[PDB]
Design an enzyme around this catalytic site. Structure first.
Site, mmCIF file in Angstrom:
data_model
loop_
_atom_site.group_PDB
_atom_site.id
_atom_site.type_symbol
_atom_site.label_atom_id
_atom_site.label_comp_id
_atom_site.label_asym_id
_atom_site.label_seq_id
_atom_site.Cartn_x
_atom_site.Cartn_y
_atom_site.Cartn_z
ATOM 1 N N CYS A 41 0.787 -1.228 0.000
ATOM 2 C CA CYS A 41 0.000 0.000 0.000
ATOM 3 C C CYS A 41 0.817 1.275 0.000
ATOM 4 C CB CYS A 41 -0.886 -0.015 1.250
ATOM 5 S SG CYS A 41 -1.970 -1.436 1.139
ATOM 6 N N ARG B 127 -7.395 -4.817 -3.571
ATOM 7 C CA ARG B 127 -6.797 -3.718 -4.332
ATOM 8 C C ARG B 127 -7.646 -3.431 -5.565
ATOM 9 N NH1 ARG B 127 -2.173 -2.864 -2.093
ATOM 10 N NH2 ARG B 127 -1.513 -4.595 -0.727
#
EC number: 1.11.1.24
Lengths: 218, 219, 218, 221, 219, 218, 219, 220, 219
Positions: E45, E122
């Site tokens: 991330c 994601r």
């Protein structure tokens, strides 16, 4: 179910050998003898149609419209009437209803499954000039009707209406004699049900006007 | 409902001019051409029955059982077969089902109410030797069928099964010519619908074998 | 279910190789032969499209609009018409409906699951100038149709309407000869169903216009 | 419908016909990674460029134990004709199977039908499925927009590395240094294909670079 | 469910690191790249946020609003952006949605329970200037995204809209080279999930910018 | 719903900064102070965690296991503990539950929507060595708790159990003095809610250990 | 059910030792500390009432109305207040609700059946000048409350509202010392539950102001 | 509901706390007659005079094998405090148990709650229950009106005589000739008790005869 | 169901020995003592009616209308009153309701099936001048009521209303002595239930004013 005496005859519209009919509305002011027969080109039926034809003026002078009915097509009706003219020299002078889908037959209780799931029995209905069912007969497939009793019944009902009377057992309007001759004693061989049998039938030594109508005596 | 191609043809038991039939059980090992006609003693139907009868040997050598059907009784059927024999010299050699109560006709989608609520249309079903529905045709009351196309269709289906092939448009098993003559150009006067009209019809100057079958040419 | 003879042909809107159509509204005043074919790039279908195309003037002079239909996309249709022009030298002159989601096919009973759950059978429908379904045929996947019988059927139906007549078995409007040649005797090899088999198919010694259309004699 | 296939769960199972024969999916490819992708229609141009790009990269997928398999709602006969067409017009033979999803049953299982895009064609969906039949990643591009074949390869590398090493991979990760070149040829755009036969005839007369009626390219000024 | 391509992007209101947003209404007239990340203070991330931040001007010149999302609180978001600035010298220049109760995540199909019952995957969504969803990708927790492919996708969609064209496989607006360096081969150690493990993690020989983001290379 | 005094504390399994916990199986034989805090990286919460951490030995010598809880992830928890260690020099010595989907919070009535639909309030529960809920407190988001009163409450409950007595208002086990210093009078500036405001917050002249924890006096 | 922080405090009408009250209509513009006690003439409750009474001016200067509650009648309440005045020299200066049928107690979740099916627990509710519930505590029957913490909580809440601030752990408005003396260490003997035991209790040598309130020290 | 308890049927059963400990009713009193009575509220005046009168007559009930038992919706701690208050103010120790029926469960079974009288307190109900646990007789007096303790004794005598001898007893029957004297003290009426603490303080300055704040007497 | 103290007494219309009554409407402005007795011509009842009759002036001077009730007919009522006058020299001066179908008895809870499924018990109801039920008693079939206590109850209730006071245990308005003599000690033999037993009862040597009312003394 049971058509009800004293109530309007079940209404219907149908094709006939005389064209479309609206029943009993088309016959208002006339008495009607509506009768059914199991099948065109079967022998008892032919003898009944010939007898009715021979008595057509007896019904006409009594203001009676005869009308037959079977589940056969109108084209089979015309062919059968043509055949009766060819084999017997008699032209059927009254209409025959083509009741293909049994809608009229069911309204009149004419289908008795133990007799036949496809053909009407020998039902007959006397209907007066107001469309009211007055009397009815149900004879089986084996047994031709008594045309003079139909005339007597019409006479008895018309006399009852005209004079405000009832008619006793065996009543007739005037003294008379119903003659039944040697010809009336001949019985009918049940008609063939295959083409091969119909061809063989004409060689079995009976009195046959056509393959489907052979007589003998008992 | 629409009978389904590639599925067993709807089974039935019925009365016919040859005796009772149990369908398709009685015809296992034979191909079947089941066809319907609206009414005995009507003219297009008569021309079709004569054509099928004349072609009876063509179907027999192809292991095809012809079977007709209308909602008329067997007694009408027999009378009609007698009439055709007298007027046309041909004896119908295949059975005709008397489907009195339209039970078989409804199984095959043969009743189309805008055409008739009482008569079948001109339906035809090719059924193979395993009882499987293979092809079907629905022609209307006005319009006679093409008997040679029925034979070609049988040949195409039998060849497809036998050889593991498909058949193209306009396929035939060997070169051939379908001749249509002046006789094939005559049209049919719609049959009379009253007895009085039937008597008058025979006096109108058409080419009439009987009251119900009168022909003319178009001008 | 069974499309009903004598009733309005099931209405629909669809995409075609000629653009969108509203059926039968767009064809009022014209007769319509609507027919279906199982799949683009399959051989019986190709021979039928060529035969219809060669006879396009026969249909046009009878006021008949030809219209095909399959469950293939319009892009597949155009590619197939391009292929037919390239391999056979004929340009398909009539529209083909792209009925991708089978909506029209089911309205016309064209899906017979034992034949195929994905392709239509060889259905053909004659529709008159008022949009009424007049006649119909259902041939299986194996068996090409008879184009001259479609023309004859149109003639018989149009003559019936115009003259108020019926047409007998084997009727034609004037004497004529339908010739079937040696070329009409060639049968079709079932098309390959894998790409590898399609490549091998062109090397098997058949008479092949393309991988999917190979002919032989029996 | 339109249900989202679930990551980390078995890929939705189905049986279908393909250009290579019948498939039982994903069971037939167990022990292989699978890239299942869809395309709206045979004989349409972005799709052709994608099939050519996948075909050109077939050995890259094969060396990674990846079975490519495409899918559209077109019939297998259209599929074979289109593969024949690509071979003739581009000199490339498609080396992987294409599923014929005639009745959209597989497409609906994979959320490939997006009605505002098309009620009849799949979008450009792509699914990476591992050697245990588990759905690992998925992409949904619209009808206008061809996919990036090298990013599919990179995605596979990243997932296989994650499994083999028990690691995660960062943004823009690659297994080894490399350069993805995009050339002048990669800048040509596609004219939307004709949708009538007449328009297809006219399209070939408009002066574009057309390998066939359905695939015409130009540059944007 | 699956968000529908070509339909309005699912609407929501939420807190972000830039203040409250009404989505997608507040960004009408801009293209939007909405993306999700499983959890603040986790390593893939961080690398994606830094990569997007580095490419912020590439998105800005294309009229694209970047906006992230996770199920973490806004205070966790601000803390994480502060951490990224402290550890990497990069200031995140775009908002992060705080989707505390997974309501937005569910609208976008971002929760895949076999991946996580608590964190989004994601996911990334390209939304045009009319608020229409145009394209989407769903990568798993293990696997960082390709930021240049996001930019290419935007270019392709904007070109398609502007020029009325489609774009082929591997299309770019101008010739170009995407270089991936030795730095791009470093993999990420899955982050520690206990405080004791986080302390130990810093002594395990990885390249760690912080306890939660450690890199290594593999063979 | 309101957790019930005198009944087993609602059971749960959860992830924590020390690993998974099963309540009450893991804490049989120990007293438990379960408390919640709205959000990692917020200032009141920070002062409370530091105060609990500084008093950790006071709870340990009373056989009390402290356990915190928020709806934040364990990664946020660890980051926050790291931050507290750097800014305040104390390492949080007790586990913090990551109650991501609010399942534990709802079992304990810790979500009060007018306070927050996403964060717990300042709830605290004393649970005895048999897992029975003994006492509870619910403070709002604005208002830090009194750590010495939590210790007093535990003493009073344990004394009641050990001695079979009740404890009066303001009871303590031995004479003692709770000193509150000038440090205890500083109030907290509500934390910034945007990143931009957080950057500016560190430039505004408050007494700030970090962007989220700035103090002043009133 | 748990009364909700930040929502209007459950409304009620009740009889009290000062006359009837309508809550919160009668207390608009004042803060309210509503607290319950299990039973009149029980010892922890008496020590709490004396402690609240001694601190009455501390609450009054903070614009706080104290109001107690138990399920006892007003006649028991008055008798108990009389008893407290005689034994402890303090006149309870705030109203006590007579919640005969537990209707108010049930609205406030004050009945915990494992504690008692007939008595309230030691619940306390801080309600602001707009009638909003701000904070609450639930202590069991064994355990007297901390009156100075109630005052501190009120100060913290009023300071938060007045200043727009939050207050940290252990916050007070000015430096101060809470002294707990030897007197605060005495525990309470659980009260007698029969009249006979109450007579014997006064003969057992404890420090008893009355039969129900006897103290001792531990070990 | 509320129901009338039914004469001749087992008295409604219950378990409850009392000033003498737990009771299982009427089970614990099998073989004894029971006078179960209710009073609206501890620390109210009519109730105090009735408890004193019952206490003074405790031996009359004891020699008749009668267990007296009171009941109110007050807590047991209020009960004990009230008995202590009566002992302090009147020198009389209540010698019989008082049921603490806080949740009105027993009161409802006995039809003791009449909402137009009080939705929170019982009325002045009294029940005579025999040694087989059968309900034999009952009275319901309102909050204003104290009972007649000698009539309770006479009722017990009458029922026990009926059972023992197989007889009925006429109007005004007693077992032996006797005289019930009512004195000048029995003419004093009761001031309705204060209901606020301030009023209770003021009440003690109003010039009545008050043994305590809640029990002030005068004459009419 | 129990009649409710403090509410209007259940209303009814009924036939009585004095004519029809509309209850309690016909007694507006008067207090009412409504009482029931199981059966005419039974002995306890007779002693109660004589006692009420002898005390009729005590009730009249207190503005109290006495009204009795049983399920017997009015003709049996009149016959019984005649019998009482002949055997005791007392004329009943108040009405008796004939509640044949138990409709009033059921409204007042006077039917206790274990006592009798056909007769009322000895119920008595004091109703004030507003028709409000003020007090009630239910004595069993065996046990005659205390007439002076009924008068005392009325005095106590009227004084409470007039003075705004309550009355203590054993209250009377003036000092007084209730004398019970040797005559008050005679018990009643349970009445015969067959005609034969009634004839035999008169031969058993008791003091019988009539077959149904025989007295004796017991040791």
């Amino acid at each position: 179910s049971l058509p009800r005496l004293g109530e309007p005859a079940p209404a219907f519209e149908a094709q006939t050998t005389f064209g479309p009919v609206k029943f009993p509305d088309d016959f208002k002011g006339q008495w009607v003898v509506l009768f059914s027969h199991p099948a065109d080109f079967t022998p008892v039926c032919t003898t009944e149609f010939v007898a009715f034809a021979k008595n057509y003026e007896e019904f006409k002078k009594r203001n009676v419209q005869l009308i037959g009915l079977s589940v056969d097509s109108n084209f089979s009706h015309i062919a059968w009437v043509m055949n009766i003219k060819e084999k017997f020299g008699i032209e059927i002078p009254f209409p025959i209803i083509a009741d293909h889908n049994m809608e009229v037959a069911k309204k009149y209780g004419m289908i008795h499954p133990a007799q036949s799931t496809t053909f009407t029995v020998r039902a007959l209905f006397v209907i007066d000039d107001k469309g009211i069912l007055r009397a009815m007969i149900y004879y089986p497939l084996t047994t031709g009707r008594n045309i003079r009793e139909v005339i007597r019944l019409v006479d008895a009902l018309q006399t009852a209406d005209r004079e405000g009377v009832a008619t006793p057992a065996d009543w007739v309007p005037e003294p008379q004699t119903w003659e039944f001759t040697e010809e009336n004693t001949k019985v009918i061989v049940p008609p063939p049900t295959t083409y091969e049998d119909a061809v063989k039938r004409l060689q079995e030594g009976y009195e046959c006007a056509d393959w489907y109508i052979c007589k003998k005596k008992v």
